[PDB]
Write a protein that binds this ligand. Structure first.
Ligand SMILES: Nc1ncnc2c1ncn2[C@@H]1O[C@H](COP(=O)(O)OP(=O)(O)OC[C@H]2O[C@H](O)[C@H](O)[C@@H]2O)[C@@H](O)[C@H]1O
Length: 203
């Protein structure tokens, strides 16, 4: 579709549809759209420890589109469990076009803490594992961590893309076929970072 970005080839004289396929067959797509318009089976949201969905711009976009039930169901899920760093909570999608939202408590950059890298990578891995376990086909990651949590966008781009490759190399997948990277149309920094990394991988 028209929301599928291209990336410029490293030689600069060509442009390629924003699509990369791992050797194992897992497809990654560069998509320019609001997370609120995602149509994958799963969409990933980053949330604080207290699970309030109206504090960050990403989550707030999801809340407004989905309706107040998203906050209500999230709070329901969180009641029985001790919510901590890295926890993933699943809800239904309400007025969103996806089937499930995976709400993740993502870490602060903390000046490039190695702890934060590891935690973010493991969140990303886990969300894909969950998606496969639910027998679902596709998952959309927006650029979680790159706003209030302060992950540099170039570093986040290579982090998530490398994790998707790694996950694909280590797993035989029965249903998970697509990972979409959802970039907000005005987030020119993320669009560049993700495009640059696709160019590198393709070369
Ligand atoms: N509607 C959208 N669609 C797609 N991407 C978006 C959208 N809106 C913003 N972005 C991009 O979404 C990315 C992330 O922006 P943030 O919402 O700050 O999430 P964080 O993971 O950094 O952490 C902040 C939250 O977590 C902490 O617990 C705080 O309490 C907050 O609740 C940015 O690159 C935006 O450009």
């Amino acid at each position: 579709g028209t929301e599928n970005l291209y990336f410029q080839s490293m030689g600069k004289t060509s442009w390629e549809k924003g699509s990369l396929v791992s050797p194992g067959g897992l497809q990654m797509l560069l998509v320019k759209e609001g997370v609120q318009n995602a149509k994958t089976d799963v969409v990933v949201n980053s949330v604080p420890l207290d699970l309030v969905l109206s504090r960050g711009p990403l989550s707030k976009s999801l809340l407004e589109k989905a309706g107040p039930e998203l906050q209500e169901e999230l709070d329901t899920v969180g009641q029985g469990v001790a919510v901590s760093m890295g926890t993933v909570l699943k809800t239904s999608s309400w007025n969103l076009d996806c089937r499930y939202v995976l709400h993740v408590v993502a870490p602060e950059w903390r000046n490039g803490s190695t702890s934060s890298l590891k935690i973010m990578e493991d969140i990303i891995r886990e969300c894909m594992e969950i998606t496969e376990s639910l027998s679902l086909k596709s998952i959309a990651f927006p650029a979680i961590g790159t706003g209030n949590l302060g992950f540099p966008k170039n570093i986040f781009a290579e982090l998530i893309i490398s994790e998707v490759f790694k996950f694909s190399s280590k797993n035989q997948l029965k249903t998970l076929q697509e990972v979409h990277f959802l970039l907000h149309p005005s987030d020119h920094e993320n669009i560049q970072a993700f495009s640059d990394e696709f160019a590198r991988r393709a070369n």
